[PDB]
Amino acid sequence: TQKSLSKEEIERYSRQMIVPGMGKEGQLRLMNAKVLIIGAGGLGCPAAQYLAGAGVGTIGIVDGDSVEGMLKVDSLITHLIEINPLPVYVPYRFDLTPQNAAQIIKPWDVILDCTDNPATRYLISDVCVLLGKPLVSAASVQKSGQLIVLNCPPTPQGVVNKKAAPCYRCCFKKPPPPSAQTSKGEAGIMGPVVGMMGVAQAGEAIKILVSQLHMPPKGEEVSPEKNLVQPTLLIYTYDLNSAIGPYSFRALKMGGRKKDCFACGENSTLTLDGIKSGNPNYVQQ
Amino acid sequence: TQKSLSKEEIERYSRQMIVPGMGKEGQLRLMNAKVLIIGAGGLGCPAAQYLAGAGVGTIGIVDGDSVEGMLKVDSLITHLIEINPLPVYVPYRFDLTPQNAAQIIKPWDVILDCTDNPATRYLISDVCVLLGKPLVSAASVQKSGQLIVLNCPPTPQGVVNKKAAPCYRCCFKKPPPPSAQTSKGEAGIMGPVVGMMGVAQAGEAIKILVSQLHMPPKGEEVSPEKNLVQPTLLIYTYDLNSAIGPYSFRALKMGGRKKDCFACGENSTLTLDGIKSGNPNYVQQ
Amino acid sequence: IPITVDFSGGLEMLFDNQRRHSISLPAKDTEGKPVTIAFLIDYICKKLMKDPTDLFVLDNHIRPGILVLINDADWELEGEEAYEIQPNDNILFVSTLHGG
Amino acid sequence: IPITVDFSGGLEMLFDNQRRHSISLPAKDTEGKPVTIAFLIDYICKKLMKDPTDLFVLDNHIRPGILVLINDADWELEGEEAYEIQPNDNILFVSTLHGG
Ligand SMILES: [Zn+2]
Ligand SMILES: [Zn+2]
């Protein structure tokens, strides 16, 4: 709702206010924006740091885990105020589940996924899809990382009749593999990988808000130079036995909603009521 | 010199200790390592953050500038202890010049460049070359950023007879353009760009140390799968009107030492004594 | 047919830290009809592998985990495991990442 | 000769936020001999430009600032401003970044 800029705010944001695309007009977008981050460790931290810094209006965070007593949500928020006092930080000081995930998302304009568990990753997309929200998902384990921008702009469930942004299921159809799953606790993590990926995640979120890419298009089709409906899956491999290689960042363009997707496709048996009840039980393991 | 790992250290580093390439062996490399960052604003912060976190032995920082009273060096170091108490942080609480730059580098194993001024950027390479040190240079203005790994492994000045890593002059031969120069203060900066670039810079530095790539090779040639002697110049353009695009990360392989380079090439009239005196006066503007 | 094969996403670990793989194939399969990508999976897993099978292919089919791309194009629309390989094609095997 | 031309490194700002540029060229220059890259600079700066000249080319030559790459290959070894352009070549104009 805020229409004008504080001398306080004008001073803080002037460095990125004077860039093509980001006027008093472009900045107010971010200040009224409401972004949510699911997961506070690893990708959460840098993602949150670069939203905070950018002056995203409200920044949510969801993690019931503690540090290695004190929840990691709290630790991080305490950190973020130092970067930017002005944003409203909103800690969900527990872990997301089917019972709540519906409740935890309906408020927020853009969803970031840093969840680190495959079951949860599927859950979010489902909900995000149903509620009609854009997902910037991102993953990192060991020496490798990857990122993608799903359901932007958010096309209603089952509307296959129009060129329409792919869901996480549409992409990554049925896998997760049961015994091929490594965790960040299991397999470790190099710092710059999770860092690159988080920072980029924030990058995509900011973009979505500032250029208003979650806004459905004018019977007109959506420009393909946005890479929204046909979005790249950027794969970062970190080779600590080599310098930056031509095959360091490979960009795999992806298909629009799979007409037969379980969730966002034609004849989906997926209901918000469903997930709550335990309907698509996330026993895929 | 340290041969063994504290329970303190073993606890902190276990997450990246269990990754291919990074044993008790690979980690001790970083702990005895001495890295220097020239420039504390913008690219300095994230670069320093991901070295600190990684447990780089000693981390130097050089910036005479204050915040927007209190020097930005001090501000940042204060920040870094929070991330990792164990490293020795070393603030050069002034600005680098020809008179000192020689003095400020001779100690350090790896040099990071975040300097933001073209004259300075050339100065460092010159010195770095002469003293025989590897440079991870990186730059960012407005919506675009780029990074490269020069003089790794460090090949002595004038040794053109062997396949040899390119200097900053060898690359970017005579330009900087006098009136085409925009500063970060002049043209602004989006957050995720400088962030990506800094984090990557740390990335390259860590790699150099952990895999020991500053170490000259066995009469044997240097593997080209390191991309050291023929190193990529990664260019990141941030389009806030689009999602991650295939042309988001473009990787421009670069030429080994230009035999006729002013500085690191055959028949160079460049002396450490020279720069001190004001010899190649950095009036190129 | 000489082609380049790549790995990424914590798969190449299986193939001894190697991502880029160039090996020429026989133009014809075992039963004389042209090489399919059912072939490459079998050839690779049996010969090119440097590790224990469970992680790449199980029950005579690739693990649901991995994506396959032909010239950076979805494998599913272009042939989906029964694809006549081309004289200079690029095939990419990336294990979908579910950690963060 | 139809080729794709690209900008990056805070240059494309000059060409109205556009990076990718496809325009077919005459195979022969003004004096009848084959198109050189002295040509592309002249054609682009005069017609394709959307801004005031100082920033791209001055004194009948590109600003020292910029690098030119032909199929992601150094321009200097391959012809250096007097290069017979090829039927599907890619030429990249990137302004070297000296800020941070
Ligand atoms: Zn779907
Ligand atoms: Zn040189």
Author numbering:
A (entry chain DDD), B (entry chain DDD): 4 to 71, 87 to 236, 238 to 304
C (entry chain GGG), D (entry chain GGG): 11 to 62, 64 to 111
Kindly provide excerpts from the paper associated with this entry.
In eukaryotes, the ubiquitin‐related modifier 1 (Urm1) pathway is responsible for the synthesis of 2‐thiolated wobble uridine (U34). Uba4 is a two‐domain protein containing an adenylation domain (AD) and a rhodanese‐like domain (RHD), which are both essential for the dual function of Uba4 in sulfur transfer and ubiquitin‐like conjugation (Furukawa et al, 2000; Huang et al, 2008; Schmitz et al, 2008; Leidel et al, 2009; Noma et al, 2009). Uba4 activates the C‐terminus of Urm1 via an ATP‐dependent adenylation step, receives mobilized sulfur from the Nfs1/Tum1‐relay system by its RHD, and subsequently forms thiocarboxylated Urm1 (Urm1‐COSH; Leidel et al, 2009; Noma et al, 2009). We heterologously expressed and purified Uba4 from Chaetomium thermophilum (CtUba4), a thermophilic fungus harboring highly stable proteins, well‐suited for X‐ray crystallography and other in vitro approaches (Bock et al, 2014).
Therefore, we generated a Uba4C202K mutation to convert the labile thioester intermediate into a non‐hydrolysable iso‐peptide bond between the activated C‐terminus of Urm1 and the ε‐amino group of the introduced lysine. Indeed, we found that Uba4C202K forms a covalent bond with Urm1 in the presence of ATP, while other Uba4 mutants (C202S, C397S, 306GGS314) led to the formation of non‐covalent Uba4–Urm1 complexes similar to wild‐type Uba4. The covalently linked Uba4C202K–Urm1 complex formed well‐diffracting crystals resulting in a structure at 3.15 Å resolution, and its atomic model was refined to R/Rfree values of 21.1%/26.2%. The structure revealed two Urm1 molecules with slightly higher B‐factors bound to a dimer of the Uba4 AD, while no specific density could be attributed to the RHD, which although present in our crystals, appears to be mobile at this specific reaction step. In contrast to Uba4 alone, the Uba4–Urm1 dimer is fully symmetric and the AD interface falls on a twofold crystallographic axis. Interestingly, the C‐terminal GG‐motif of Urm1 is positioned in the same groove that was occupied by the linker region in the unbound Uba4 structure. Importantly, a helical region localized adjacent to the ATP‐binding site (aa 72–88) in the structure of apo Uba4 becomes disordered and flexible in the structure of the Uba4–Urm1 complex. In contrast, the loop containing Cys202, known as “crossover loop” in other E1 enzymes, becomes structured in the Uba4–Urm1 complex and an electron density can be clearly assigned to the covalent peptide bond between the introduced Lys202 and the C‐terminal glycine (Gly111) of Urm1. Therefore, the Uba4C202K‐Urm1 structure represents a unique previously uncharacterized reaction step, mimicking the thioester formation after the release of AMP that can serve as a model for this reaction intermediate in all other E1‐UBL and SCP systems.
